[PDB]
Design a protein around this motif. Structure first.
Motif, PDB file in Angstrom:
ATOM      1  N   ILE A  17      -0.481 -21.044  22.925  1.00  0.00           N
ATOM      2  CA  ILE A  17       0.525 -19.426  23.380  1.00  0.00           C
ATOM      3  C   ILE A  17       0.731 -19.122  24.740  1.00  0.00           C
ATOM      4  CG2 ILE A  17      -0.937 -18.958  21.036  1.00  0.00           C
ATOM      5  CD1 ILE A  17      -3.234 -17.188  23.243  1.00  0.00           C
ATOM      6  N   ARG A  18       0.787 -17.890  24.354  1.00  0.00           N
ATOM      7  CA  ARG A  18       1.058 -17.418  25.580  1.00  0.00           C
ATOM      8  C   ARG A  18      -0.391 -17.312  26.381  1.00  0.00           C
ATOM      9  NH1 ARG A  18       7.147 -14.654  24.643  1.00  0.00           N
ATOM     10  NH2 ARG A  18       7.664 -16.865  23.572  1.00  0.00           N
ATOM     11  N   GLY A  19      -0.759 -15.959  25.920  1.00  0.00           N
ATOM     12  CA  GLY A  19      -2.692 -15.687  25.691  1.00  0.00           C
ATOM     13  C   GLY A  19      -2.449 -15.476  27.472  1.00  0.00           C
ATOM     14  N   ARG A  20      -3.699 -15.818  27.693  1.00  0.00           N
ATOM     15  CA  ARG A  20      -4.077 -15.571  29.279  1.00  0.00           C
ATOM     16  C   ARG A  20      -3.695 -17.038  30.111  1.00  0.00           C
ATOM     17  NH1 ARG A  20      -8.262 -13.708  25.678  1.00  0.00           N
ATOM     18  NH2 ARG A  20      -8.129 -11.396  26.309  1.00  0.00           N
ATOM     19  N   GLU A  22      -0.635 -17.446  30.333  1.00  0.00           N
ATOM     20  CA  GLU A  22       0.644 -17.404  30.287  1.00  0.00           C
ATOM     21  C   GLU A  22       1.391 -17.036  32.625  1.00  0.00           C
ATOM     22  OE1 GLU A  22       3.031 -18.911  28.531  1.00  0.00           O
ATOM     23  OE2 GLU A  22       4.600 -18.192  29.251  1.00  0.00           O
ATOM     24  N   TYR A 114      -4.313  -6.477  23.263  1.00  0.00           N
ATOM     25  CA  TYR A 114      -5.165  -8.009  22.695  1.00  0.00           C
ATOM     26  C   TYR A 114      -6.216  -7.368  22.456  1.00  0.00           C
ATOM     27  CZ  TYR A 114      -3.165 -10.398  26.228  1.00  0.00           C
ATOM     28  OH  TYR A 114      -1.941 -11.563  27.086  1.00  0.00           O
ATOM     29  N   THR A 170       4.315  -9.586  25.605  1.00  0.00           N
ATOM     30  CA  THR A 170       3.044  -9.071  24.938  1.00  0.00           C
ATOM     31  C   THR A 170       3.505  -7.532  24.051  1.00  0.00           C
ATOM     32  OG1 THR A 170       1.388 -10.293  26.229  1.00  0.00           O
ATOM     33  CG2 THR A 170       0.922  -8.666  24.533  1.00  0.00           C
ATOM     34  N   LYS A 173       5.882  -7.907  21.310  1.00  0.00           N
ATOM     35  CA  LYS A 173       5.673  -9.063  20.220  1.00  0.00           C
ATOM     36  C   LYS A 173       4.638  -7.914  19.367  1.00  0.00           C
ATOM     37  CE  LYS A 173       6.631 -13.006  19.646  1.00  0.00           C
ATOM     38  NZ  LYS A 173       8.002 -13.808  19.943  1.00  0.00           N
ATOM     39  N   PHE A 174       3.625  -6.967  19.245  1.00  0.00           N
ATOM     40  CA  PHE A 174       2.524  -6.474  19.258  1.00  0.00           C
ATOM     41  C   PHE A 174       3.173  -5.176  18.519  1.00  0.00           C
ATOM     42  CE2 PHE A 174      -0.790  -9.522  21.520  1.00  0.00           C
ATOM     43  CZ  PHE A 174      -1.469  -9.663  20.066  1.00  0.00           C
ATOM     44  N   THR A 210       6.819 -18.777  20.579  1.00  0.00           N
ATOM     45  CA  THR A 210       5.317 -18.464  20.318  1.00  0.00           C
ATOM     46  C   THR A 210       5.455 -16.936  19.504  1.00  0.00           C
ATOM     47  OG1 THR A 210       3.647 -18.079  21.663  1.00  0.00           O
ATOM     48  CG2 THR A 210       4.662 -20.291  21.984  1.00  0.00           C
ATOM     49  N   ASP A 211       4.296 -16.627  18.550  1.00  0.00           N
ATOM     50  CA  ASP A 211       3.952 -14.945  18.326  1.00  0.00           C
ATOM     51  C   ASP A 211       2.496 -14.342  19.370  1.00  0.00           C
ATOM     52  OD1 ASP A 211       5.579 -14.621  16.619  1.00  0.00           O
ATOM     53  OD2 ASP A 211       3.606 -14.905  15.220  1.00  0.00           O
ATOM     54  N   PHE A 212       2.405 -15.178  19.651  1.00  0.00           N
ATOM     55  CA  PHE A 212       1.205 -14.943  20.944  1.00  0.00           C
ATOM     56  C   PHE A 212       1.065 -15.995  22.560  1.00  0.00           C
ATOM     57  CE2 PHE A 212      -0.843 -15.043  16.636  1.00  0.00           C
ATOM     58  CZ  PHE A 212      -0.338 -13.971  15.945  1.00  0.00           C
TER      59      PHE A 212
END
Length: 212
Positions: A17-20, A22, A114, A170, A173-174, A210-212
């Motif tokens: 994921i991208r998350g933390r 990226e 998040y 983010t 997406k969110f 990716t979604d996240f």
């Protein structure tokens, strides 16, 4: 204590994921420093976790030019270390304050986003949100509008402009439908990173969708 990160072999261990992580990927691609972008599945995590020192990802596995393997933890500490190594963390304490003021705001907004999207059962959930995220959004928007330079901390891209990319992606997406002037100002920063950091432009084009 000097890991010689410019010449060290680097392997980033994180989820796909991208998350933390990226932000770390963005720093390394902005610097055009090669690294193994190891995307771990939750299926692999229990045995990797069991065979490894750390208990949390991301980890930056560093092999220094002299062969020493060191496992670095704490995503923001890694990102800042890498930013400093490759000239992406400003030139004096006043520029760094601008970096860290913005990263505080955007890191806060990111973690708040998040945390949203995990309480959908019953009761009355029409309860208002936004005003938290709004508060961060106007502070960011005000800071971007007030700046007297092309990027957040000066005329050149720093870590804070890279984290703006993490925030934009983010938000889209969110919060796809969310319309707020901070999104436009953030997108301007992203456009300038792409323009001035060809390594980031190529990475953003080529990274997994990716979604996240």
């Amino acid at each position: 204590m000097d890991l010689q990160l410019k010449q060290a072999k680097l392997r980033l261990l994180y989820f796909n994921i991208r998350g933390r992580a990226e932000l770390i990927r963005l720093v390394l691609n902005a610097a055009e420093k090669d690294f193994e972008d190891v995307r771990v599945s939750e299926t692999e995590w229990p045995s990797l976790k069991s065979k490894m020192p750390f208990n949390q990802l991301p980890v930056l596995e560093v092999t220094t030019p002299n062969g020493q393997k060191v496992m670095l933890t704490e995503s923001m500490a890694i990102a800042r270390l890498l930013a400093r190594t490759f000239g992406l963390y400003g030139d004096n304490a006043a520029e760094v304050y601008l970096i860290e003021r913005m990263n505080s705001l955007t890191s806060s907004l990111l973690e708040e986003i998040y945390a949203l999207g995990l309480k959908k059962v019953d009761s009355f959930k029409k309860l208002f949100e936004a005003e938290h995220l709004h508060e961060y959004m106007n502070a960011i928007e005000m800071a971007l509008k007030e700046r007297k330079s092309t990027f957040i901390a000066g005329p050149r891209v720093t870590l804070a402009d890279l984290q703006v990319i993490v925030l934009i992606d983010t938000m889209n997406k969110f919060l796809p439908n969310t319309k707020h002037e901070c999104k436009d100002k953030l997108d301007e920063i992203k456009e300038g990173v792409i323009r001035t950091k060809p390594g980031v432009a190529r990475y953003l084009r080529s990274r997994p969708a990716t979604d996240f």
